[PDB]
Every structure is written in C-alpha cells, then in structure tokens.
Amino acid sequence: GRSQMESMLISGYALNCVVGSQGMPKRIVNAKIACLDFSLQKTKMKLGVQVVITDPEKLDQIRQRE
Amino acid sequence: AFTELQAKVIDTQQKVKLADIQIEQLNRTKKHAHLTDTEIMTLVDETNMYEGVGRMFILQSKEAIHSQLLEKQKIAEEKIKELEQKKSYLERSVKEAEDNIREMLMA
Amino acid sequence: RESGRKVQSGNINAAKTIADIIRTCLGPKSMMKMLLDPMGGIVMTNDGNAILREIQVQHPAAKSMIEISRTQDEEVGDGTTSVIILAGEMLSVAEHFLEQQMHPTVVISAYRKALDDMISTLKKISIPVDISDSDMMLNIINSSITTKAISRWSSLACNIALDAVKMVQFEENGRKEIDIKKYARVEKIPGGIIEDSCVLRGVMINKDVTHPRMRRYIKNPRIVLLDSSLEYKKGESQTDIEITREEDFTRILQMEEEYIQQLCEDIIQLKPDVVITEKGISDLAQHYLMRANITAIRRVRKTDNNRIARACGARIVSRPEELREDDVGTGAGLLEIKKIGDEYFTFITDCKDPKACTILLRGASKEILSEVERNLQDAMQVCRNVLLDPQLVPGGGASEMAVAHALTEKSKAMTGVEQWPYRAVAQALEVIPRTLIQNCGASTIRLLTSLRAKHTQENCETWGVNGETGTLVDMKELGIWEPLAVKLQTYKTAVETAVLLLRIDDIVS
Amino acid sequence: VEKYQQLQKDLSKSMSGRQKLEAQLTENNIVKEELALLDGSNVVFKLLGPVLVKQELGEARATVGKRLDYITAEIKRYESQLRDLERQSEQQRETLAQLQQE
Amino acid sequence: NLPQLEMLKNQLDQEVEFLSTSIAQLKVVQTKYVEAKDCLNVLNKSNEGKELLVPLTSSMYVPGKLHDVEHVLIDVGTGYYVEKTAEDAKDFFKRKIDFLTKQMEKIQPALQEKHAMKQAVMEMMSQ
C-alpha cells in the first residue's frame, strides 16, 4: 500500500488484527497484552437455574445471568 | 437437507415413549407402597412383617418399614415428575426437526 | 532420462510442432485440423485446446506446453490456442542461433526485454474502451463471439455478459480486484428462450433449487446466510455430556437448544423469512427460526451460499454467535423462487455489494441455451478483459509489426547482444500476419513488406493485415479490437514459456 | 438354497458360547482382579458342579488364570469349526442354486 | 428394482430385531446389579441377625438367620463365585451396570438405522 519508498520497519511487532476499536482505546502505554487465542463471545448461564428448555421462555432468564 | 430432519424425528420419537407408560405405575408403586404400608398397618403390629429389596425378606420392624415403605412410596412418588420432565421436552424435541421439515417444504 | 542439446532442440521441436499446425487454426479465418484414431475417432477443429487434449505428448516440453496451454485456459480459455504460437516460434528462432551462439541466459533476460517493449507499444496501440457504451464493448464481443461463429442469440445475451460480469464487477482490493468475470454465476433455465433471458440482480440461484426451499417469493424479508457454527453448546460456550437416558433427553437436548435459540434470536432479530443455512446447521437452529416461522434452509453448498452471499450480496457470517443484518440479509434484498419451464428458481436479488448480476440463461432446450452460453463465455471473458483493461487494441499484425520495429529499434538503440534476441523475438510478432496471410490465402512476403511499409509511417498503429479481410487494414476501419488485457496476457504467457522450456536441458528418471 | 444356510448353524453353534466366554473372558480378568481384590476378606469359590466347592485364592488363582486361558480355549475350537463350516457352505452355494434354476 | 428389494427387505427387518431383541434384555441383567447392591444396601442397613426368608425352591421359601452382612457375592469369571465385601460387592454390583449399559445402549441407534435401511428399501421396494 502507499509506496515502496514508505515501506518501513515498524516499532514493535507487526500486528494484523481486526481492529478492536468500537471506541476501544487506540493508544495505551506500558501495555499488558492479553492475547486471546480463545474467543470470549458471551458465555451463557447454563450453570445457574433454568438450564432446561421446554420453551423459548427459558432463554430469557439465562440471558440476564450471562 | 431433510435427512437429519427425518433422522431427528425418529430418534426423539422413541425417546419420549417411555415416560408415558412408567409414570402411572410410578403413581401406583407410589400408592401401593403407601398401601403395602397400610397393608401392614392393617394388622396393628407384628414381628413377622417383612420388607425387603430382594429374594431375602430381611426381618424388619413394620414401624421402620412404615417409614421405609412410605419412603418406598416416596421413591416412586418422585419418579413420576422426572419422567414428566422427560415427557415434557421430548414431545417438543421430535417436532423441532419436523418444524424444520415442513417449513422448508412450505417454503 | 532425456538431456542436453537434444532437449534444447527438443524445447524447440515440441513447442514448435505444437504451435506449427495450430496457427492455421487461429483467426476467424482458420484452417481446421482433422484427427483420426486407431480407435477411429475423428476430430475436425480449429480449437487448439480440444486438440491439445486428444493429442499425445511423449516429450514433457510437449506436455508442459499443455500445462502453459491450460494456464491461459485457466486464465481465459481463448488465446491458449494463440499463446503456444508465440514461444514455439521463439525457441525455434533465437535458440538454434543463440544456443549455438551459446546461452540459455541472454534471451531469457531478453524475453523480458521483449516483454516490456510490447507493454511499451501496448500503451500506444491499445486505446481505451468504455463499458458505458455496450457496442464499444460489444463490437469486441461481437468480434469475440463470432470467433466461435454463433452470432445468433449469443450476441444479445452477450449484453447480459456485458452486464452480469460488468455488474458483478466489485471487490476493490485497494489495487482494485474489481475487474473480473467469475462472480457472474450462470443461470440454467429449461424453457424460456435467450430472448427472455435477462439478468436479475445479485446471483440467480438455480443450482441447489429444483423446488422452493426458500418460501416462494420474498421481497423485504431478509435472505440470510447461516454458516456453520449453528451447532449446539450444551454449556455456556462449552458442550457437556450428551443425551443418554431419560432426563438427559430433556436436560441435555435442552442444553443444546438454549445456546442455539440464543443463536437463533440474532437471525430473527434482523427480520428474515427465508434463511439459507449452509452446512453446520442444528435442527435446534431451525426450529426457533420455525418458532418465528422464518424458514431456515439447511445443508446447502458454499459457492451457492457465496452465490447467495453474492445474490443479496450479504457476507458469510464469521461470528454466528453475534449476528448483524449487515452480516447477512443486507440492504432490502429479494428472494424469488420462480418456475420457468421445469424448475423452481430461487432469485435472491436487489443485491447490496456493488450490484451484482448473473447471466439468466433461458434456452428452449438446454442446447439452444448452451450454444449461446459458450459464445457468451467469450464475452464474459472479454467483458472481464474489458473490465481488466478497457483499452481496445487493433487486431491483426497491428501490434505485431509495431513491437517488432520497436524491438528492432530497441535493437538499433541497445545494439547489445540482445538486439539479436529482439530481432529473434521481433520475428515472433509476424505470426499473426503469417497466420492471417495463411488463413486468407494471400502472399505474405509482399504483405510482410507492405506491413513493414504500414509500420514505416503509420507504425502499424491500427494497421495489421487481417486475413479475414485478407488485406493490410486499419483495424478501426474493420472495427477489430481487443483489450490490452488479453494481448499482454497471451503475449507474456508464452514469453514465460519461452523462458521455461529454454531453462530445461535435462530430464532425469 | 439350503446349501447357503446349511453349515451356518453348525458354525454359529461353536460360536455361541464362545461369545459367552468372551464376556466370562472379560470377567476372568475381573475375577483375577476380584481375587487379587480379595485377600480373603470374603470367601472365594469356584462354583463348579451343583456342589459348592469351598475354594481358596491360590486354588482359584491358577484357576482363573487357567479359566481365562481356557475361556480363550473354546475360542480356538470354533476357530477350528469357523473355517470348516463357512468355507464348505461357500462352495455349496453355487451347487444347488443353478440345479434348482436348471 | 422391486423384487430385489422385496428380497433384500427380508434381512434388514431381522437386523432391526437382532438389535431390537438384544438391547431390551440387558436391563434385566442390570436389574440384579442394582438389586444385589440394594439387597446389600438394606443388608448393611439393618444388621446381622435379622430373619432371612430366602428361596428354598419353587412354590416354597425357607427362612434363615442372617449372621453376615459384609459377606456378599459377586459373579464374575466364568462359573465362579467371588463373595466380596459389602462395599466391594456393591462396587461391582454398581460397576457391572456400567459396562453392561455400554454394550446395551449402543444397540439402540443401530436399531434405528437398520430400519432406516429397511425403510429405505421399503420405499424403493414400493417405488
């Protein structure tokens, strides 16, 4: 991209990542990096009450505790 | 593809079938384990009363039996609902894939 | 094991004898090739490719030509018959001189010193065509589709390729991938006729549709791609022990259901009615889509969904746990499953992504369908070529004798050793005049002169011979045109092969 | 044809309790366990004959080792009659098939 | 088409019942496993010294006086008797359920597919 003249060494590691900024901090410093090999993606609550689904109802009160 | 849609409707079909036949005798073996207690409660007291879990009739005080046997009532008293809990969801689960069969066909 | 000056001469012979017979088969005027087999199989073709198949190759150079032949065929499928005519010349020209003038190397670099001067000349002779004017594309197309000699219902449906391919032009990669063909996904219609064969937006989905699996007709409601990752989680993000006995049937297959019901909601939240789920579907994932009475279409192929991801032009869901209407079911979209002739045909249309359009192909039979599509296949490939470089170039020897001088002028300029490879390579350009002078049946040596005379002033700018007109002609007065795309490709292609075989002096067992 | 089915019963005959063995075979590993698991805590009996034989670990130790070995031994007797019966009924299959077709 | 599937349908129904008959009967063999465990449950529950009415022979039963709770059988090996410990026997009373349930339960999905194999022949036999 840009031009072969602007091709450059880059401070710190080369990082291609889907940018996490929804409003995430764009800059930080003294960064503790927690790199997640695993997705997070909303663990449910199936450990609490109402892990049983006979109805679409049982999805709601799981969605509050998750 | 309707194959697993036809596959799930067969498996959960025979899943739910058991909870119907058992639940009533579970009420019976509830009621009868009350009755068999009432049956020994018939004669006010006896030493020759037996309650046992096998070919052995281990000689037991009918009192501890009245407990144990109303306990044996409570055994089959509970199993009705866990079947009814089986009876509850499995009836809907077989139609889950069936709901998928027909809509895609209506679609 | 085959090695040495033999393979060197063998690099000549194979690519030579391949290219030799085939130039007669080049051109709208073309001299056909007969085949016979000890099996009795008879083949009458101007088609190198078809020839390139049933022929036998006992030399890997003759075999690797088929490879580089399929290269241009992988690329386009035409000019393959042309590409072989280039290197087969080159090695048959420079080498026996210059390999007995001793080098693999000189002409190799000169193959590039050849490759650029074309590009140089190409920046002159190739002049831009606009996709806004259909004929300005279609005249090339009319020229491209009459190459296979059906102008009948191909031409009007080549507008459809002039549209569908141009309208599936999309995906700028930032150096702009957009120029393309493949995203155009042909429709197959029993019944109808190429007259009423006309684009619908996105991709018209014939392939998995023999019957509606997606409603009947859907306008606003979103056609939705659910892509793997609809399988259950019995735990929060996890999966515990599965159904075994009584209450596990309840509890576990419920544990399976909630996570998917949770996945289900995000689909229904974006208001679908039809939902096309490729493999990785749960019956759990459908039945709440059934609870919303929103059809979930399961276990259907990827390209088809990518067709559908091109049909409403939605994406494929990369995080099916958190879903967006921006993900799948974009825009307003459309889904229309129409019986035309025999088969119900899902049309997922009103495409977001830059349009998208697929060629509606309606034959009465599938034959009168197929005859069009095959010549259509030329347009849609020339369309992408016009999409690739929209510079129409004069055909015939117009580019040939042009670059030849400019190469020999580069010989005059550079006056090195590779001047001789130029005069060897610039000699390769004259194929088209020779090919055309063959295919017209005229005298080349005058027309060779006369085309050098056409370059002596005009620089053969639009002037080659056209054997099809049989005379040295402006290709503007003949309206003969090709994109700079197809030229350099075919040009460069055998140049690479001219390097390739020349590299190979050795075969080892 | 009966020729197809003829030797398969004689076959599965020797296979029948051989299968029963292979559960006993598995439980012979378990009785080796449950002998090793019994230090004499509760009595160990080879039940052989309608008479209960008072028995010991070392009396049953070789034995269950001998049983498991023997409970592998009725395997080979079928393995004898395995390829006896399935093979000759394999020839018989064509014999009266065509004759009855004839 | 049809007659070969009239002929082939014969075995698949047996493959159904081969699997149908087998799975149902192992619960009967599991009955004794929990039984003997439970028979050993109430055994340890009360005491040694209770009267035991035990089967004498058909149409009859014989009484008896229980002097051993912790003395309890397991049937493993071949024809073999291991009298085990109250918890030992229970453990195998327990555990003999576990392995047998595996061989038993595996049979049910194969039951379906043999019918799904027969039912598939039925259609193509009728179609």
Side-chain angles (χ1 to χ4, degrees):
Chain A
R2 293 184 181 178
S3 296
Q4 61 285 359
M5 298 175 184
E6 297 173 353
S7 56
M8 63 178 286
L9 60 83
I10 61 108
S11 294
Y13 286 93
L15 171 53
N16 189 27
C17 53
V18 171
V19 293
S21 294
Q22 64 180 22
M24 177 190 77
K26 184 175 172 60
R27 183 189 183 282
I28 58 200
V29 66
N30 195 36
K32 298 296 285 185
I33 318 293
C35 302
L36 303 185
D37 191 7
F38 52 88
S39 295
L40 301 179
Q41 294 177 339
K42 183 182 74 181
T43 52
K44 310 299 176 66
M45 183 66 73
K46 293 185 175 74
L47 296 175
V49 300
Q50 190 176 357
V51 66
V52 293
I53 302 262
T54 58
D55 290 338
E57 297 176 350
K58 307 293 187 294
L59 173 62
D60 291 344
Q61 293 178 335
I62 288 199
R63 182 177 296 176
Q64 180 63 260
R65 294 178 179 84
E66 64 178 342
Chain B
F2 299 156
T3 300
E4 291 300 321
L5 298 180
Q6 187 174 355
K8 181 180 178 181
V9 298
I10 301 308
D11 188 5
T12 304
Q13 185 175 355
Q14 63 180 18
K15 289 181 179 177
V16 66
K17 293 180 69 66
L18 179 63
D20 179 68
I21 60 180
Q22 300 294 321
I23 185 187
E24 295 304 321
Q25 185 175 355
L26 295 170
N27 292 129
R28 294 288 295 170
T29 54
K30 179 187 66 63
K31 290 175 66 66
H32 191 200
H34 175 59
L35 184 63
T36 51
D37 186 5
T38 304
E39 294 303 324
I40 189 52
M41 286 178 176
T42 305
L43 296 184
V44 58
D45 189 4
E46 183 69 15
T47 59
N48 293 131
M49 170 58 180
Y50 298 92
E51 182 178 6
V53 282
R55 303 303 300 278
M56 166 184 73
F57 297 98
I58 185 143
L59 183 60
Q60 290 179 332
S61 64
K62 57 182 292 179
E63 180 63 17
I65 290 175
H66 304 302
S67 298
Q68 182 180 356
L69 183 50
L70 295 179
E71 179 181 1
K72 183 181 290 180
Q73 179 181 359
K74 183 60 175 172
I75 300 304
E77 181 178 1
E78 296 177 351
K79 189 68 179 297
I80 63 174
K81 297 174 181 176
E82 296 176 351
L83 269 67
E84 185 277 335
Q85 183 61 258
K86 177 180 180 289
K87 184 177 179 180
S88 63
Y89 171 65
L90 278 61
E91 184 69 13
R92 301 179 183 86
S93 300
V94 57
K95 186 176 292 296
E96 292 178 350
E98 180 180 2
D99 288 343
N100 316 146
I101 297 178
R102 296 174 295 102
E103 186 73 17
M104 295 168 72
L105 287 172
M106 180 177 74
Chain C
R1 296 184 182 177
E2 301 304 321
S3 298
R5 178 58 177 164
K6 179 179 291 295
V7 174
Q8 294 182 335
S9 63
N11 295 289
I12 295 181
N13 301 135
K16 182 181 173 64
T17 189
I18 293 162
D20 292 346
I21 193 57
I22 294 186
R23 69 164 62 201
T24 58
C25 296
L26 289 173
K29 285 186 178 175
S30 57
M31 299 176 72
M32 297 177 183
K33 190 175 185 294
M34 182 179 285
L35 285 174
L36 177 61
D37 288 344
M39 298 177 284
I42 298 153
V43 173
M44 287 300 300
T45 48
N46 290 127
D47 294 345
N49 296 131
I51 290 173
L52 289 167
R53 292 177 177 82
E54 182 63 13
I55 60 168
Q56 62 181 20
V57 292
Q58 292 302 321
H59 184 196
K63 181 180 178 181
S64 297
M65 288 300 293
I66 297 178
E67 299 303 321
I68 67 100
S69 299
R70 300 295 175 268
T71 299
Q72 187 67 59
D73 182 69
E74 293 168 350
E75 188 176 8
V76 175
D78 185 67
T80 73
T81 302
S82 298
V83 295
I84 58 218
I85 315 299
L86 303 177
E89 179 73 10
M90 297 174 182
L91 293 176
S92 298
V93 175
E95 178 172 0
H96 65 285
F97 292 98
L98 287 161
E99 178 63 16
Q100 294 304 318
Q101 292 166 331
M102 183 58 184
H103 65 76
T105 302
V106 173
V107 181
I108 289 180
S109 63
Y111 286 133
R112 299 292 173 266
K113 303 302 288 185
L115 174 60
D116 55 355
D117 183 68
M118 179 67 174
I119 297 164
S120 297
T121 302
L122 284 173
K123 302 296 175 289
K124 292 176 293 297
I125 183 183
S126 295
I127 178 182
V129 53
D130 286 346
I131 62 183
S132 63
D133 182 4
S134 294
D135 288 343
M136 195 173 178
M137 292 179 70
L138 181 63
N139 66 345
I140 301 183
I141 293 175
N142 293 336
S143 296
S144 176
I145 64 201
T146 194
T147 300
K148 292 164 62 179
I150 297 95
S151 295
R152 180 189 65 257
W153 293 105
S154 298
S155 297
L156 294 179
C158 291
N159 291 337
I160 303 306
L162 189 149
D163 292 345
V165 167
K166 178 180 75 180
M167 295 174 182
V168 294
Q169 187 180 3
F170 56 80
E171 295 303 321
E172 292 85 357
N173 57 26
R175 58 191 180 94
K176 295 181 176 71
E177 178 188 1
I178 50 173
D179 47 357
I180 195 67
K181 177 184 64 63
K182 178 188 64 60
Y183 298 107
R185 298 279 181 261
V186 290
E187 181 70 13
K188 292 290 178 288
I189 296 218
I193 197 50
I194 299 291
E195 295 72 341
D196 62 12
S197 170
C198 295
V199 291
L200 277 70
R201 294 178 63 185
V203 177
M204 303 172 294
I205 305 299
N206 55 344
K207 288 182 175 177
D208 282 342
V209 187
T210 59
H211 66 285
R213 192 166 292 107
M214 293 179 278
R215 289 295 184 189
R216 298 286 182 181
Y217 298 89
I218 293 295
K219 306 295 181 291
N220 186 30
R222 299 298 185 271
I223 175 50
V224 169
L225 280 71
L226 293 177
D227 297 336
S228 296
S229 177
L230 268 62
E231 192 65 13
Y232 60 82
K233 298 293 181 292
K234 307 188 184 85
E236 298 179 350
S237 294
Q238 294 176 333
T239 56
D240 289 344
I241 61 172
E242 67 178 343
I243 56 106
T244 301
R245 296 300 298 273
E246 290 181 350
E247 293 81 3
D248 285 344
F249 292 159
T250 295
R251 180 189 66 195
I252 298 308
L253 179 61
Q254 288 170 332
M255 290 180 179
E256 296 184 354
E257 186 182 4
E258 185 279 338
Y259 170 80
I260 305 300
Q261 294 173 336
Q262 185 67 258
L263 302 186
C264 292
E265 303 305 321
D266 294 344
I267 302 124
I268 293 91
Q269 294 175 338
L270 67 87
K271 183 182 168 59
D273 195 59
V274 294
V275 175
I276 184 115
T277 301
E278 66 193 351
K279 181 63 184 296
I281 176 67
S282 294
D283 300 349
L284 304 169
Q286 287 175 318
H287 78 286
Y288 178 79
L289 283 161
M290 308 305 104
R291 294 181 186 177
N293 291 283
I294 294 173
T295 306
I297 289 83
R298 66 174 296 177
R299 294 174 63 88
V300 290
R301 291 171 294 182
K302 309 302 181 182
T303 299
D304 296 344
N305 285 278
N306 194 340
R307 292 168 67 96
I308 299 180
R310 191 170 300 106
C312 56
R315 73 185 190 89
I316 56 186
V317 292
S318 296
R319 185 177 65 198
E321 293 183 351
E322 182 66 15
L323 293 172
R324 294 171 295 180
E325 185 174 1
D326 293 344
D327 292 343
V328 288
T330 59
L334 294 174
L335 184 142
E336 297 172 351
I337 300 200
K338 297 185 177 75
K339 181 181 171 62
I340 302 116
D342 181 7
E343 295 175 351
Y344 292 121
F345 291 146
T346 304
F347 299 100
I348 295 125
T349 53
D350 185 5
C351 187
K352 306 296 180 292
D353 173 71
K355 288 192 176 79
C357 289
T358 48
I359 295 167
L360 182 67
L361 288 171
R362 298 184 181 174
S365 176
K366 305 301 285 187
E367 178 62 17
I368 187 171
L369 179 59
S370 296
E371 296 176 350
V372 173
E373 181 177 1
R374 293 192 297 273
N375 313 129
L376 176 73
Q377 187 63 259
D378 295 346
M380 65 187 284
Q381 292 173 337
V382 172
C383 294
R384 71 173 300 173
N385 288 131
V386 176
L387 302 185
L388 175 58
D389 187 354
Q391 289 186 336
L392 40 69
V393 72
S399 177
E400 312 311 318
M401 194 68 73
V403 180
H405 290 78
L407 285 172
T408 60
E409 297 169 350
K410 191 178 182 181
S411 295
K412 307 304 180 181
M414 292 179 68
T415 190
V417 292
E418 294 185 353
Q419 61 173 13
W420 302 95
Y422 300 147
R423 300 182 184 88
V425 172
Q427 186 62 58
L429 301 172
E430 302 171 356
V431 53
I432 296 203
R434 296 172 296 178
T435 296
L436 293 178
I437 291 147
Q438 290 178 338
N439 291 336
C440 64
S443 65
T444 186
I445 57 192
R446 299 295 182 88
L447 303 180
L448 294 174
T449 286
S450 298
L451 188 62
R452 291 173 179 79
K454 291 297 186 67
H455 191 288
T456 303
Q457 299 83 1
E458 301 162 349
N459 296 132
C460 291
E461 186 67 14
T462 178
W463 288 270
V465 67
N466 200 31
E468 293 77 4
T469 192
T471 58
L472 271 63
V473 289
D474 171 4
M475 303 300 177
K476 300 182 172 72
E477 68 190 344
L478 270 67
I480 303 307
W481 298 104
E482 291 178 352
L484 185 152
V486 65
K487 280 292 184 67
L488 177 61
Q489 297 170 334
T490 295
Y491 176 82
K492 176 189 61 61
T493 300
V495 173
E496 300 170 350
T497 303
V499 186
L500 175 63
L501 297 178
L502 176 61
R503 294 175 182 169
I504 309 293
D505 294 349
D506 293 342
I507 300 174
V508 178
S509 296
Chain D
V1 180
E2 72 283 4
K3 298 292 182 291
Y4 292 82
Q5 303 294 100
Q6 187 173 355
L7 279 65
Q8 292 296 317
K9 290 184 179 298
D10 291 344
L11 180 65
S12 64
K13 177 186 68 64
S14 297
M15 181 66 177
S16 62
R18 174 183 176 274
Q19 297 169 335
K20 177 186 63 62
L21 299 177
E22 296 173 351
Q24 299 170 335
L25 183 72
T26 301
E27 293 178 351
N28 284 325
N29 296 284
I30 297 175
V31 65
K32 286 181 169 65
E33 296 168 349
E34 298 186 0
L35 287 183
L37 295 173
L38 286 173
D39 54 351
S41 296
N42 294 278
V43 292
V44 289
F45 294 150
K46 73 185 185 69
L47 173 70
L48 296 175
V51 54
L52 174 66
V53 192
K54 182 63 164 60
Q55 282 291 313
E56 295 305 319
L57 293 173
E59 296 177 352
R61 181 54 185 162
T63 300
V64 301
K66 294 188 294 184
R67 303 301 293 270
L68 177 70
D69 294 345
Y70 161 74
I71 302 303
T72 307
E74 303 184 356
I75 296 178
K76 299 294 180 64
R77 58 156 179 76
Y78 171 72
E79 297 300 318
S80 298
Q81 293 182 338
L82 167 59
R83 300 178 185 173
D84 295 345
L85 301 164
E86 67 189 345
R87 175 61 187 87
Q88 292 179 336
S89 179
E90 181 179 2
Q91 181 177 355
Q92 292 178 336
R93 73 173 65 197
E94 62 185 343
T95 59
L96 271 66
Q98 184 62 58
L99 296 174
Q100 290 173 332
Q101 291 180 336
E102 186 178 2
Chain E
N1 187 29
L2 308 183
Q4 66 175 19
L5 298 170
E6 294 175 350
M7 177 179 71
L8 177 63
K9 180 176 175 290
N10 292 283
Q11 184 62 60
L12 302 177
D13 190 5
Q14 295 177 336
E15 298 177 354
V16 173
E17 186 65 15
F18 293 162
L19 301 173
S20 179
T21 300
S22 63
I23 182 178
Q25 296 175 336
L26 295 177
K27 292 182 175 73
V28 178
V29 182
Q30 294 174 339
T31 300
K32 63 179 69 181
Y33 297 147
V34 178
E35 179 183 1
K37 179 176 73 180
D38 292 346
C39 295
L40 170 49
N41 287 337
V42 175
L43 176 65
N44 302 135
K45 178 181 177 181
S46 63
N47 63 36
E48 297 173 350
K50 302 300 187 180
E51 286 185 350
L52 263 55
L53 296 179
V54 293
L56 179 61
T57 187
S58 69
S59 296
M60 297 185 71
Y61 297 91
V62 59
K65 293 182 173 73
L66 175 68
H67 294 79
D68 292 336
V69 290
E70 297 296 317
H71 292 77
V72 285
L73 181 74
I74 294 291
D75 186 6
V76 295
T78 300
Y80 191 87
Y81 287 150
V82 277
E83 197 79 13
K84 298 296 287 187
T85 306
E87 299 308 321
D88 289 346
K90 286 184 181 79
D91 290 344
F92 309 110
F93 293 157
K94 177 61 174 173
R95 191 187 69 193
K96 287 184 293 185
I97 300 142
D98 296 345
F99 176 79
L100 180 62
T101 302
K102 177 177 71 180
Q103 183 175 355
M104 179 181 73
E105 184 278 335
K106 68 186 185 69
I107 302 171
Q108 188 173 356
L111 170 62
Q112 178 178 351
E113 64 185 343
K114 299 297 183 63
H115 179 61
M117 180 66 182
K118 175 178 73 180
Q119 185 64 258
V121 172
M122 289 178 178
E123 295 177 350
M124 297 176 183
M125 175 185 73
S126 63
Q127 298 174 337

